């Protein structure tokens, strides 16, 4: 959510319904932004994931409102996108088949990953289980580094 200028087209009619929902998200983000001086590394990353997951949830909310629930108007949605309450790219990915669930965009860039391949969270849990069984071990991981993703839930 950006800052209201003269160049900001004001929010259309149906925004008054949703404001308090995404307001909460905003508040959370504010809470999630501060020097919570985690000496630890893993926990520090955890905080970051809290922001990431929160972002996902907010964007996911707007996506739901637009597409699954089919409630809010198109203009309103557009406005929201422009203001960036919800990430557009993420939504686009969601709309595409296979990524119906998707933590975030960073988990599907094969360039960034040292092995030219997606984030392990994208591997469906069942597959991982199968692999583990074959090997003998259990699910080695619980959440990837890029975001707090205990499975990315393609299924």
């Amino acid at each position: 959510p950006r800052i209201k200028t003269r160049r900001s087209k004001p929010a259309p009619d149906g925004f008054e319904k949703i404001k308090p929902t995404l307001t909460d998200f905003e508040i959370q983000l504010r809470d999630a932004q501060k020097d919570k001086s985690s000496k630890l590394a893993a926990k520090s990353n955890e905080q970051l994931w809290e922001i990431m997951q929160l972002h996902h949830q907010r964007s996911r909310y707007i996506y739901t409102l637009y597409y699954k629930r089919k409630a809010i108007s198109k203009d309103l949605y557009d406005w929201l996108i422009k203001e960036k309450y919800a990430d557009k790219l993420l939504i686009a990915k969601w709309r595409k088949t296979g990524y119906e669930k998707l933590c975030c965009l960073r988990c599907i860039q094969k360039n960034e990953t040292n092995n030219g391949s997606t984030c392990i969270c994208r591997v469906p849990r069942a597959q991982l289980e199968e692999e583990a069984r074959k090997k003998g071990t259990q699910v080695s991981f619980h959440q990837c580094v890029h975001c707090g993703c205990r499975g990315c839930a393609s299924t």
Partner: peptide, 23 residues
């Protein structure tokens, strides 16, 4: 694999949505 097995098993994750607990 049966798609109802995945339906029952994706509610076993104690958290909602992307972060599941899976125990």
């Amino acid at each position: 694999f049966t798609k109802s097995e995945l339906k029952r098993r994706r509610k076993t994750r104690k958290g909602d949505g992307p972060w599941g607990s899976w125990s």
